[PDB]
Amino acid sequence: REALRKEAERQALAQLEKAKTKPVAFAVRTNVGYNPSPGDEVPVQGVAITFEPKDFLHIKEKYNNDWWIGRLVKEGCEVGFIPSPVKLDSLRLLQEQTLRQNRLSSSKHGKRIPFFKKTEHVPPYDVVPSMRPIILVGPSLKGYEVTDMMQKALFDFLKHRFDGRISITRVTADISLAKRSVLNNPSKHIIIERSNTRSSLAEVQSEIERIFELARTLQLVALDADTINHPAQLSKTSLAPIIVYIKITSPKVLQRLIKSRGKSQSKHLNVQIAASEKLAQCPPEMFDIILDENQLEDACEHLAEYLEAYWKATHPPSS
């Protein structure tokens, strides 16, 4: 009875050991939190992973129908058992039923689903690249010289600073189109309209596949994505980028920089100033790192430090 179960718990603990050194099979970003409890029937008691909404998990293997093996992408965190989407759904359902059981008959009805309202189902996990692609936004719009040059200086810095550990590539499709819901069912989102779009969804899909593949061996991935000027353009995709905001805090400074480029750039001052203002209006949490340093070496050092910390989070020594 309890010897069979001491045993099958030894098989699972052996598989968990072995998983420390497997490659990352795939990564997810969660849409739900999970607090394990003993009744969850974790294959090794006490070794489920706790996580919150929007955490990142690297998955080594699917252990069985109910459990995966992997780790939170965070320094010090080691592999453990992670509930599969199936298991999370079964636990969620039990949690709703147990809520009804514990309810007080003195309670009144809940606030109603308002009639006819359409909701997209959100799965507990979204598959994301195993290394979050680094995308630069700011100080103003891409395709103008102040922004393009300042961004180029930073990727040039990264190319040498993380040589042997990084891929830097230009994205050839408008990746803002890669909405999780559109990519997951393209025929459900056909909209007949007149628009200035330049990429097909097939092209966008090939690009997303290429990005995932660059990240599979856990090298840093940086993208020159020229259509992406604002983090909201990617927040509904399953790219989960690291958004790096190059921030010129003083718009008077930006105006003078644009003017330094000559009349052919400063005739577009207004559009560039407006874009810079929009980034400055953004809640700071839509950025992963804000570089507001006025020296290139200083902005570089800050970004490199962040990326070294991200390297540590993605490459544990037990790997």
Partner: peptide, 18 residues
């Protein structure tokens, strides 16, 4: 004084992006 320093630093940054 900060404007002047910002301009000098960011102008240098731009050149390095050439």
């Amino acid at each position: 004084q900060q404007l002047e320093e910002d301009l000098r630093g960011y102008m240098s940054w731009i050149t390095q992006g050439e």
